[PDB]
Amino acid sequence: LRKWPLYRAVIAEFVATLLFLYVSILTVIGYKAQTDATAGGVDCGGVGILGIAWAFGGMIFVLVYCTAGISGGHINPAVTVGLFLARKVSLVRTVLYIVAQCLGAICGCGFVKAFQSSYYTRYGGGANELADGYNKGTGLGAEIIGTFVLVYTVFSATDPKRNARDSHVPVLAPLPIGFAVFMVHLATIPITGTGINPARSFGAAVIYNNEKAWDDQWIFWVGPMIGAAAAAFYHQFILRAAA
Amino acid sequence: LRKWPLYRAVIAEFVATLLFLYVSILTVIGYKAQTDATAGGVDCGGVGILGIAWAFGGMIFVLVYCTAGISGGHINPAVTVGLFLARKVSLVRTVLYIVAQCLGAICGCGFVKAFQSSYYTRYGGGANELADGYNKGTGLGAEIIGTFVLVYTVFSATDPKRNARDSHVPVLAPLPIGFAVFMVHLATIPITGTGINPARSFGAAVIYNNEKAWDDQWIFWVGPMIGAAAAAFYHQFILRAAAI
Amino acid sequence: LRKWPLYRAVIAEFVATLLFLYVSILTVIGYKAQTDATAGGVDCGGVGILGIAWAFGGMIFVLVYCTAGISGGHINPAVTVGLFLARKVSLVRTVLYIVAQCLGAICGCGFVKAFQSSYYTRYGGGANELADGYNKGTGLGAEIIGTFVLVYTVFSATDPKRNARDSHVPVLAPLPIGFAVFMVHLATIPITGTGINPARSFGAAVIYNNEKAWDDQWIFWVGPMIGAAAAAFYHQFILRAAAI
Amino acid sequence: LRKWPLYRAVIAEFVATLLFLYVSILTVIGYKAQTDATAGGVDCGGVGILGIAWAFGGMIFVLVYCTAGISGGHINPAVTVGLFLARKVSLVRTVLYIVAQCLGAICGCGFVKAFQSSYYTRYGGGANELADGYNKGTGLGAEIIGTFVLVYTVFSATDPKRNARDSHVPVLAPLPIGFAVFMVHLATIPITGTGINPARSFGAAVIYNNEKAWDDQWIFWVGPMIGAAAAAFYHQFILRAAA
């Protein structure tokens, strides 16, 4: 049937997101646990904020590869919308994929508190937030262009020759995507902590649960979607890679 | 002959694990010796703990690439045992790898301290234990998922067609598997130093031998197996990508 | 139509360079803002200057991968000009890229300071200049070889068969080229911040505009060209791997 | 003719070695220039000794790829001997390849002094040396096993299907080799600064020119060759990958 594999192709998206978050989170939180804030431990010496940026782009690359020929290796709500606005994701999928992504991200970040809870709460919760020093418009713009780069990669990465089984869904070359994320994280983590993935953003937000988080949560949906839409427009028409 | 190509690989495992544990732990002890205790050493200016995580990751990347069409690139009881529940490595072929790998680790581990026994001993010796602040359940829960992440990555990394020499043992591109190892560490080192490898943990426990360390060791066997047995279960049925 | 697939790529260059300069410099300024001046910031605990070098490297890796079968993945006047002496990019097709790339950089550069004009200005703005202690000849000699390393890497990275859309423009795997960019930086950043990209340097010089910076800028054009013209010469004849 | 391409296949080995060294060197020296010794600059903050290890394994990977289908992508005297002892390098080549490698390495490190000369001399010269704290036997053993890993990769990396033009010389998969180097550098740089490449070792030695360097230069030829020989024995016979 069509309903059973679609369901299974969605089950993957949920699982991979769960893994992706908590690794990236417990990397961030593990970093923030080893690297001291004010006092009570060692300054620096952690994985560096280079190590954190490795966690995201690295876990993504792995999972995209793990979830390539199944779901399509989407793992990102912004990416899902891009591919959808590219008229190549069967509507109902995206609605489910977002539920899939946003579910597991809550789960993932949830498994992190359970482990520590102590050093979790004090240390950021791994939740995306505006860094003090920048205006909101600045932060919004970075998320837009940032996500744009990620999504621009995806479409370029789609090989028409190779496709997912029991579907017309584009399988993705797993490496440059995860590397594109890593580049963006290197560029962004100061400003916002790098959202460009509403699943992640909404994920830790539910768990960490802070006024400043919820107040600034509105960006990492708007910003990314704007970019993913722009990247779709940039790829399928003004580069016209459709034909 | 079945024995000559089998032992061909049963050794290749042992060697890789020897090489694996050697390069990795020699980095860790190196990192320790760079920052060290008050009087001697400078902080931060080592490889960074990221660099340690690199060592464990990339070594898996190359040793699998070398032992791909030979042993199948396990270098891990969990990965091997995981491929047994998956009914892809016949019983007797597993138990050998299980033992063959463990010895290499020890041989790899013991080789390291002979270089730096003075330093080695004072600085944790790359032994898998709980960092204080974490309840034992936290440490256990960390290993199972971390192993799962890898073993699942290992399974999605199974070519349906190509075999290692003279068996039904998988052969596929390793680069993701190395990252899975590398990734997990970055998030798991703060807790246990990242085990997700029963032989590696066992090999560290044998040489170092510290009671509080040695009686926590049970976790890094109990844990990883479950995470592997789950990933095998999930990938083979809950995804059922094996059905054809 | 010749114009529609040409401009198809003439834009793709411009955009990549815009994206390139944006992501890279936003990291640098980020690094600056993390350590900063006495009162504000913590040292070391940034990405590390290695992380900066990563940004320049990997961005070349992905933007070439995106613009491989489109523009041919130059994102660099030197690389483009280098492929002109190699007689592989017809005259008029180069001059466009030469200009098309430069604008993107500026557009990419200008976009960055609009985010952080306060910080940006106080912290070097990713502008290519000589760090004190180096004579100007040292800085020049650094850029030429660094560019050579890349442009030579670019040439050894030329598939004899596959073209970009509707031209005779090469298409081959990018991963080495990204590393060449990444590698050179690690050894060249201490001197100039690593130029090896005339458009990038020009783009940085336009927005930042500082006289002592702006009148040293001539180096990062004079240099890279020579290193590119050499690599093209060496690869095409001294190795003569192009002859068939 | 046979003499012209052989000569050209040797010209590549020289060039790539020149590049490899000075980049790795000026990375090491650039690191040591930015990172202070006792006083006169900033502590840490450099590329880290992770960044240095990236320079070696990274430059190698690039150049091996750049010099694959030509020379065979050898770049290392130890590797040359291994492939030779594997009965698959036409004797005369190795003698020339060593001259090729050891020449450019001197050149490379030479271009570094010219640039700085000031901060060159005080800061190690990028020359391999025993780290104070270890015995010589310890240091020798690391170079042996270290080089072994590098060379074991090479043979495993040799694809019999693909071969260099106008030769029977094995082209190498450029990535795992350069990555194997990187791993070893991460493991070794404390102890010796990682030799496993007599070209590099003899390269900076000529330029830096120190008593302690020349005294301890004897290791990074003996050690590596022992390993490269062992890796050859480990590969071609007790793994018997010859047939």
E strand or H helix at C40 = none
Structure letter (DSSP) for residue C234: I
Distance between CA atoms of D153 and D151, rounded to whole angstroms? 5
Structural element, H or E, at residue D160? strand D158-163
* Nearest CB to C238; choose among D11, D25, D51: D11
CB pairs under 8 A between A and B: 105
Per DSSP, the three-state class of D90 is: coil
Instruction: Find the CB nearest B66 among D35, D141, D153.
Output: D153
Is there a contact between B171 and B162 (Cβ–Cβ < 8 Å)? yes
DSSP 8-state code for residue B125: G
Q: Which of A182, A147, A174 has its CA nearest to residue A55? A: A182
Distance CA C184, CA A15 (A): 39
B chain contacts of residue A12, beta-carbon cutoff 8 Å:
239
* Beta carbons within 10 angstroms of residue C85's beta carbon: 17
> Who contacts D123 (Cβ-Cβ below 8 Å, separation ≥6)?
D29, D32, D33, D37
Are the C-beta atoms of residues B213 and B127 closer than 8 Å to each other? yes
CA D53, CA D184: separation in Å to the nearest integer? Answer: 9
Say yes or no for a CB contact (<8 Å) between A53 and C47: yes
Amino acid at A162: R
In A, which residues are within 8 Å of C46 by CB distance?
Answer: 48-49
Instruction: Show the tokens assigned to D221.
Output: 């030829």
- CA D127, chain centre distance (Å): 12
Interface residue ranges in chain A relative to chain C, Cβ cutoff 8 Å? 35, 43-44, 46, 48-50, 53, 133-134, 138, 141-142, 145, 148-149, 152-153, 156-157, 176, 179-180, 182-184, 186-191, 234, 238-240
CA distance A155 to chain C (A): 9
The token pair at D195 is 């030799």
Q: Which of B176, D177, B53, C68 is closest to A178 using CA atoms?
A: B176
Residue A162 phi, psi dihedral angles, 5° rounding: -95, 135
- Amino acid present at C173: A
The CATH number that domain B1-244 falls under is 1.20.1080.10
Using H for helix, E for strand and C for coil, what is the string for chain A?
CCHHHHHHHHHHHHHHHHHHHHHHHHHHHHHHHHECCCCCCECCCCCHHHHHHHHHHHHHHHHHHHCCCCCCCCCCHHHHHHHHHCCCCCCHHHHHHHHHHHHHHHHHHHHHHHHCCHHHHHCCCCCCCCCCCCCHHHHHHHHHHHHHHHHHHHHHHEEEEEECCCCCCEEECHHHHHHHHHHHHHHHCCCCCCCCCHHHHHHHHHHHCCHHHHHCCCHHHHHHHHHHHHHHHHHHCCCCCCC
Does the beta-carbon distance from D12 to C239 stay under 8 Å? yes
3-state helix, strand, coil in chain C (%, to 5): 70, 0, 30
Tell me which residue of A57, D182, D47, B48 sits closest to C23, measured CA to CA.
A57
Chain C partners (3+ C-beta pairs within 8 A):
A, D
What torsion do the CA atoms of C200, C205, C206, C207 make, to the nearest 10 degrees? 100
Contact assignment for A62 to B176 by CB distance below 8 Å: yes
A1-243: what fold?
Glycerol uptake facilitator protein (1.20.1080)
- Three state DSSP letters for C120-172: HHHCHHHCCCCCCCCCHHHHHHHHHHHHHHHHHHHHHCCCCCCECCCCCCECC
Smallest Cα–Cα separation from C193: which of C107, C128, C99?
Answer: C128
CB-CB contact of D33 with C142 (8 Å): no
Q: Which of D12, D65, D111 sits opposite C176 (nearest CB)?
A: D65
Residues D169 and D228: their CA atoms lie apart, in Å, by: 17
In angstroms, the separation between the Cα of residue C100 and the nearest Cα of chain D is 28
CB C107 within 8 A of CB C15: no
Give ∠ CA B59-B65-B67 in degrees, rounded to 5: 100
Angle between helices A77-85 and A92-115 (to 10 degrees): 170
Q: Per residue in A46-56, is it b (16+ CB within 10 Å) or e — as a string? A: bbbbbbbbbbb
Closest CA to A204 of A45, A11, A27: A27
Helix (H/G/I), strand (E/B), else coil: B163: strand
Burial D223-242 (b: 16+ CB within 10 A, else e): bbbbbbbbbbebbbeebebe
Taking alpha carbons only, the member of A163, A166, A139 closest to residue A223 is A139
Considering only CA atoms, give the Rg of chain D.
17
Rounding to the nearest 10 degrees, give the CA dihedral for residues A210, A213, A218, A219.
180
* Cβ contacts of A4 within 8 Å, gap of 6 or more: none
Q: Using the beta-carbon criterion (under 8 Å), do C149 and D65 form an inter-chain contact?
A: no
Residue B114 sits at φ, ψ, to 5 deg, of -60, -25
Angle (CA) B210-B216-B220 rounded to 5° is 115
Task: Choose the closest CB to A61 out of B156, B179, B238.
Answer: B179
Which chain C residues touch D if contact means CB-CB below 8 Å?
35, 43-44, 48-50, 53, 133-134, 138, 141-142, 145, 148-149, 152-153, 156-157, 175-176, 179-180, 182-184, 186-191, 234, 238-241
B175 vs A contacts (CB less than 8 Å): 175
CA distance D200 to D17: 8
How far, in Å, CA of A45 to CA of A223, rounded? 33
Experimental structure resolution, Å: 3.7
Which DSSP string do the residues of D165-222 spell out, in sequence order?
Answer: TTS-PEEE-HHHHHHHHHHHHHHHTTTTS----HHHHHHHHHHH--HHHHHTTTHHHH
Direct distance between the N- and C-terminal alpha carbons of chain A, in angstroms, rounded to an integer: 31
Residues 6+ apart with CB under 8 A from C168: C88
Of D134, D176, D239, the CB nearest to B116: D134
Q: How far apart (Å, rounded) are the C-alpha atoms in residues D126 and D108?
A: 11
Q: Quick check: C145 and D19 CB within 8 A?
A: yes
Tokens (6 digits) for D10: 């040797």
D38: amino acid identity, one letter:
T
Q: Residue C47 is encoded by which pair of tokens?
A: 């990405």
Look at residues D56, D70, D50 and name the one whose alpha carbon lies nearest to residue D20.
D56
Number of H helices, E strands in chain B: 9, 0
With tokens 């060379």, the residue in question is: D151
CA angle C60, C55, C215 (to 5 degrees): 85
| Minimal-distance CA residue of chain B relative to A175 | B176
Query: Measuring CA to CA, which residue among B144, B187, B241, B158 is closest to residue A11?
Result: B241
Name C107's Cβ contacts closer than 8 Å, sequence gap at least 6. C14, C18
CA distances in angstroms from B76 to B96, B172, B218, C234, listed in the order given: 12, 17, 16, 47
* The pair of three-digit structure tokens given for residue B59, joined into one six-digit string: 């070594």
Strand partners, D170: D163
Count of residues in chain B = 244
Pairwise CB contact (< 8 Å): D47 & C50: yes
Q: Is B206 exposed, middle or buried (0-12, 13-18, 19+ CB in 10 A)?
A: middle
**Which DSSP letter does residue C39 get?**
T
A42 forms beta bridges with A35
- Dihedral (Cα; A42, A45, A48, A52), 10-degree rounding: -70
What is d(CA A141, CA A136) in angstroms, rounded to the nearest whole number? 9
**Whose CA is closest to B152, among B175, B177, B133, B135?**
B177
- Residue C190 CA, chain-centre distance (Å), reads 17
User: And the tokens for D91?
Assistant: 């004797």
> Which amino acid is residue C65, in one-letter code?
Y
D108 by DSSP, 3-state: which? helix
B/D interface, count of CB pairs below 8 Å: 98
C96-111 burial, b for 16+ CB within 10 Å, e for fewer?
bbbebbbbbbbbbbeb
Those residues of chain C whose CB sits closer than 8 Å to some CB in chain A are 8, 11-12, 15, 19, 22-24, 26-27, 30, 33-34, 42-48, 50-51, 54-55, 58-59, 61-62, 65-67, 70, 111, 114-116, 119
Cβ pair D66:C241 closer than 8 A = no
SS3 content of chain B, % helix, strand, coil (to 5): 70, 0, 30
Between chains, do C186 and D15 touch, taking CB under 8 Å as contact?
no
Question: Is B173 in a helix, a strand, or coil?
Answer: coil
Residues 6+ apart with CB under 8 A from C154: C79, C82, C83, C177, C180, C231
Rounded-to-integer distance, Cα B145 and Cα B188, Å: 10
